[PDB]
């Protein structure tokens with residue numbers, strides 16, 4: 001019923017100005033009911049761990065990162081996932097131009113194909129970061145808003161959904177804003193479920209295309225030579241000419257590519273340089289990290305090979 005006079009909620013966010021303004025925004029902008037929203041938020045928990053985690057050579061650095069993902073068990077499970085969802089994977093390739101090895105690599109690195117999807121209630125993580133974390137409160141408040149709208153539309157109970165300490169969800173660990181901007185109903189059931197492997201596959205593919213993935217284009221090409229003078233990383237940008245002058249030569253032809261990022265991997269015995277192409281940068285659009293993108297790519301290649309035999 002109404003309860004117009006029950007204006008103050010209990011719980012961890014009871015006397016929080018940010019939580020109050022947020023309820024006002026949801027009611028005002030999306031037609032949410034203040035009392036219904038207060039009941040939900042009165043159950044939300046302020047998690048210290050979420051706050052602590054958000055507060056964040058050659059020595060073989062890449063080798064250590066790589067072995068976290070590329071192991072016999074992971075490659076074998078990757079083969080099983082690929083075979084199980086081969087039609088969806090092929091359909092995503094045809095529709096979005098994103099190859100199975102990239103989608104398999106992303107879902108493998110993110111959740112080991114649905115095995116590790118997160119144990120934290122999304123509501124708690126998002127409320128905590130929205131109401132008790134000034135540094136990124138605006139970003140997370142936006143995620144919480146979208147999360148509550150997602151739950152309303154996919155008919156989920158907001159308190160039942162679990163995920164990462166930052167509110168990432170399902171097979172591909174999509175943030176609420178990614179669900180909003182990039183998730184698709186790939187299964188064809190009329191719904192968008194981040195926990196449905198077919199929807200997740202299509203959604204990851206759409207995210208990639210949206211971020212500029214070029215179908216059939218090379219991701220990166222290993223270089224012969226060393227370029228210690230030049231700054232490196234996925235954000236760098238050099239003409240092929242400058243890289244050549246630096247002492248590098250590509251192991252594979254670079255087609256019409258005239259520029260590339262200079263990637264450097266620490267392989268213990270030394271440094272391994274690569275010419276980063278646009279598609280490599282597109283992978284970093286999922287997680288801003290050279291190591292992450294290289295692991296996603298190589299895990300997918302490893303699985304593709306293991307499938308052959």
Ligand code: NA
Pocket residue numbers: 184185186187188189190191192193196199
């Ligand atoms: Na669906």
